[PDB]
Amino acid sequence: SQFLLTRLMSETERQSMESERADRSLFVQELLLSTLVRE
Amino acid sequence: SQFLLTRLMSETERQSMESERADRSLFVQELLLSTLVRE
Amino acid sequence: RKAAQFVDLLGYFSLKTPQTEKKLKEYSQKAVEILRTQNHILTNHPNSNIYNTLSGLVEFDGYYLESDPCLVCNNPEVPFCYIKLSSIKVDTRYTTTQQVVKLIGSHTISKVTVKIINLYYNNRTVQAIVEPARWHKAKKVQLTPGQTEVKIDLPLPIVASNLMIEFADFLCNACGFCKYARFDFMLYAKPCCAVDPIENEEDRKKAVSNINTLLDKADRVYHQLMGHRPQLENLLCKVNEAAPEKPTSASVNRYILQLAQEYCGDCKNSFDELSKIIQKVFASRKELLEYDLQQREAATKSSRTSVQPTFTASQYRALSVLGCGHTSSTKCYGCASAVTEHCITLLRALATNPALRHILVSQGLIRELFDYNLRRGAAAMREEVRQLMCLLTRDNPEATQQMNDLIIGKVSTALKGHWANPDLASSLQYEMLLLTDSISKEDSCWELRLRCALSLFLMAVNIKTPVVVENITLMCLRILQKLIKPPAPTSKKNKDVPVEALTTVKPYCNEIHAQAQLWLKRDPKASYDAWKKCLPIRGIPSKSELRHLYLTEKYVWRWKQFLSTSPLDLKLGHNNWLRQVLFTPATQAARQAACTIVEALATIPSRKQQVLDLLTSYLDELSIAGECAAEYLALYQKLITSAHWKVYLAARGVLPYVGNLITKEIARLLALEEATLSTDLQQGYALKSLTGLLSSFVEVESIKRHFKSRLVGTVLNGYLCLRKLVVQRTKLIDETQDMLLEMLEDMTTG
Amino acid sequence: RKAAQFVDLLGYFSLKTPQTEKKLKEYSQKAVEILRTQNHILTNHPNSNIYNTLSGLVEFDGYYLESDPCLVCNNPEVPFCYIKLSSIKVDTRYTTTQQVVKLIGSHTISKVTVKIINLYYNNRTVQAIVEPARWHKAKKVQLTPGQTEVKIDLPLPIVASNLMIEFADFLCNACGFCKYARFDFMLYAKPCCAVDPIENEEDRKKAVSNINTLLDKADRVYHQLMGHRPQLENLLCKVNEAAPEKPTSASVNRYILQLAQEYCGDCKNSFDELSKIIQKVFASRKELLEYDLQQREAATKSSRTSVQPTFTASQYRALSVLGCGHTSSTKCYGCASAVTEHCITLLRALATNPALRHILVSQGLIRELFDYNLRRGAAAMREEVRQLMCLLTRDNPEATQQMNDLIIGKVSTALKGHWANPDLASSLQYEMLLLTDSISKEDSCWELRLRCALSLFLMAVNIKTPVVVENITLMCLRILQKLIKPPAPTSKKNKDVPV
Ligand SMILES: [Zn+2]
Ligand SMILES: [Zn+2]
């Protein structure tokens, strides 16, 4: 516990991060559906 | 011991085979010496 | 696995019957198609990963992770055994002249021996022993008066659950004690899976209820057994990582212990219980079906208009319950493995016909065997497949080339990324074993196999990693050693002469005609036959004749040189792979194999001089590789056992070389002693070896007389410096000091 | 392994001190060079194959197949323990007011608790207890009358083999029975490896002879220990084939059981005996050198013309026997492993500075970590190496592309020949674990990692082999599932609304 190197976020950035996570999720859903389209 | 498929040389060919073994041994000796020659 | 005798007969008949080539092609196509289908089934099996991982860690008999139980696999051949009647006895009753016994279950009795009579039996389960119409007679035996042992031999084994013994002609009704005699019973029996017979409607209803209960229990046990698979795959994933753990049967990895407990402990028990319940269900189904068929036939025979439909003998067996319990499940791992074994055996038998061999190799069998059956199955089948692959290439240059290409490609691809992963170098044992097996069997395609072995050797001789030295260079060195030193002759005319006197050609003294660089590139001008054509045959006199031979040889050689391929000169380079191999610390067997190789390379004095020159040049490696040189020295001291070689080496100036090496490493010893206090358990090995070598050089009289005036200074300086040692002293340094003092006193007597 | 605190402080100081870019470059080069050299030592080591294969089958503490014993690995920090005197008592004598006891060996006593005085000790081994000038006083104690337990404390621990207890102020001379009181003795001690001192010339000859005997015994045991290696190679080769054998602790493969017995049973015992003998030899050598140094200085001091050579404080420690037993062996597997661990820890500390991160990735650290330290060491070190590899690519598109190229190339090459060898698909767990770890942490290069995952998924989704499904497709499906369904929001205004 005495090791120094072992001991090596706001709310606005939290809402931004949540919205970005939702956007990335939607993009991945679209990407996955794009590979199931009939050729 | 009753299986049929498990139960599947003269002296002249014996000396022939021994001489051929000697020749192959000599050839391998020469071929191995040829890789140690100074470049 | 029941079809061993069938495939045996099939292979024998196919081999002994002479047949047209179209039929041979059809037979080969059939065998190969079955083999391919079984291989495809094996590699894609849902449990293939689990079994393949478990095979190398635990010892298991069967495959207990199968959804559909296989009748062939859970019904082995159980042999008859001698059982006491008391051991299976549960309930008994006695009367004036009869005895009634109930067993714990049903048994298939074959013979009854009584040691000091009418026998009845039945297969109806009752709870009360007390509970002439429900007994079946089995055998009536009369006894000679005064007889002591009787053997009631039943011609047909009886399936019985309750027995009765009645004394028809010559007992306590409460306790059964008899004062006339006391009887003991033996049975030649075994457990059997059978049910009570059905005779009326209520028995049929009870049978239906019993079968429903059995199906429920089987479903429960099956779900329990299948519930173990996720845990097994989790433990497999944790084992595959192979992360070291810190803490002699308990020192094994805890995950391996858990895997063994999970598979051989619980899955096995659940499989056995499921097998028993499945057998009971099958017996009940058979009994019910037989009763239903009998009732239907009795109902049909009552009508007169319908005529009884006759059946041929085979049709009766097909229709009756006789042909019902001999079929294997479709998705069965064990049965597919058995079919693969039978395919390998049949193909091995077939391949002894050269035409069939050619057709088989044209089908593409070598690659299928290489990809799939080299590494799958028991050790015996693996060696069997290696034998078959060697046999398929017995005298076919194209097949030999194809197999060599597969082996070389696999080894090269593994060796490319060996630096980043040692598993690649650790998973070539079967390829190298195949190469060893193919080479060890002499044929007319030996040159191609030797070329493959030598190419692999020269490619991987300079890699210092211990895994490559243990797994590639060692096998190639063993192959080379087997080829260099052929087995001793057994013929009567050659029972004494050595292998040196058997060659039909005599190599030139100062020239080497074999050229490995062009040979490895498949140059027809540097082939084995071309090389043999270049050497003079071994022949089976006055001064004039000797002179004539001298000038003829000299000027013929000059003429050949003027015309010129050019033979190589016997000038051995001082840096090669030989120094690397001779002193490798990865493994001692590689050093021993190289030592035998170079010992055999030195037979004719012209090559011996160069070999000794190179080995002398390797002298400075004693200090760096202290104990690892133990082999090399044992070769060197063997090669100079004769005096004239020692004198020749002295004439080249090795005594100052050895003296300088001794002085230098003695100075190193003094410098180390002055500074540090660490202990070295190999200290003084290089000193001891070098001083012993100098003693061996000196003992002969000519060199001792000549070379004393230059060596006394080094000897005395070394002796004094070693005497100065006080702390970094071991036994070897003491022996070196003694031997140096002995040399000092021997030198100064003149 | 002694240098944990040093590298801890070094990483902290390098991180806290703002420094120019040339110094940062020098520091990064030094660390990476040490890591590279240790990796090269470990891969080519003669015992590398044996230890690497044994790690995944048996559980062992140390590496017992080493030619030169390592003092650092042979002398761990043993603690003090409470030992009753009668447990180690061998010979005893009682007299009217004194008691003499001999122990089994030499012990380092720290404090003595006596339950219901003058304490003497010496470190000379004698065979007869009957056998004031050869005793050393330790502590003189006065007791209040009626005291029952006295805890005598020795400010400096004493290395003693024989003890003596005297009653200066207030027993049977035949049996030692005492009627007044009963005494029991406890020691705060631990075993010690030390030899008798040298005071004259005959003792020097005795020491020399004993050292020679110890060296002979050590040589014999060393040859016995090195004789086990070919058997280990034979068993290792038999294990590698992994041929099924037909017959729950005894249901394991018999070859693995034999390997465990050969390594953890006999090699361990031989190594322990060798370590004990080496420690005895070292102690005897140190005693002999100290006596020789004292004799030489006494001889030099008698001459008058020569001046005594003054030494500074560091020179005295360098010359004397104080700095003599703290060096590790040159070709030591355990010490090289420890140095690689320290390198990984220091580099993980260093990579948290973006400029140092760029310099480190410019040195070529990612490929060295990929080829060598992904699959070597304990589980914790492997996870730490994965963490460092992920951290080095936190916001570097080129580094992320390079790592993705390495992963994709290895997976594709393994999957090309998966039909003929299942281990190819079974030896990708660390690459896929690396990909999972990199994706799970959110950054600005998520698109490249997702592209790598999706490419690997579509490349191996149509393969029916169970090993590919369990080792490739399942991991990619889990990555895709994690990306599709992100964790529930934690912000107060989004605590209820869905994704
Ligand atoms: Zn089956
Ligand atoms: Zn160490």
Numbering used by the authors:
A (entry chain C), B (entry chain D): 289 to 296, 301 to 331
C (entry chain B): 3463 to 3578, 3590 to 3604, 3609 to 3647, 3699 to 3775, 3788 to 4080, 4087 to 4110, 4116 to 4301
D (entry chain A): 3463 to 3578, 3590 to 3604, 3609 to 3647, 3699 to 3775, 3788 to 4039
Paper quotes:
CALM1 and KCMF1 bind at this C-terminal interface, as predicted for the trimeric sub-complex. The C-terminal helix of KCMF1 inserts like a pin into a hole in the UBR4 Armadillo repeat and is covered by a small lid insertion within this region, which also mediates CALM1 binding. CALM1, known to mediate calcium regulation of target proteins, engages UBR4 in a canonical manner, with a long hydrophobic CALM1-interacting helix (CIH) of UBR4 docking into the cleft between its two lobes. Although the C-lobe of CALM1 adopts a calcium-bound conformation, treatment with the calcium-chelator EGTA did not affect the CALM1 occupancy, suggesting that the cofactor is stably bound rather than acting as a reversible regulator. Still, its precise function in the UBR4 complex needs to be discovered.
